[PDB]
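Q: Could you write out the predicted structure for this multi-component system? I'm mainly interested in how the pieces pack against one another.
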Amino acid sequence: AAGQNVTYKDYGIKLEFEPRVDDDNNVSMRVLADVSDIDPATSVSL
Amino acid sequence: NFGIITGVLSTINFALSNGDAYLIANPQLSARSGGRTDFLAGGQVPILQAL
């Protein structure tokens, strides 16, 4: 609401990995890959 | 007292402009049947959004 709490946001290189393996070593997986950097062009001042 | 006081003014314009813009975006993905894949190549901007 309103118009206080402080939160922290991650940035940089991030990986998440959830593998699953079969008897033939087949891999079923979900992977998240994120690369982010701070951009001065779109930063505001409040 | 009978008379008149009046006049005219003018402005000259000779503006001329042209513009072109081209873009192609070719993203490619891979996913398994029954699954889902999301892709973003861009940025994020902060927005004020509160109840």
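A: Regarding packing and overall arrangement: Chain B touches chain A at residues 32, 43-46, 48, 50-51 (CB under 8 Å).
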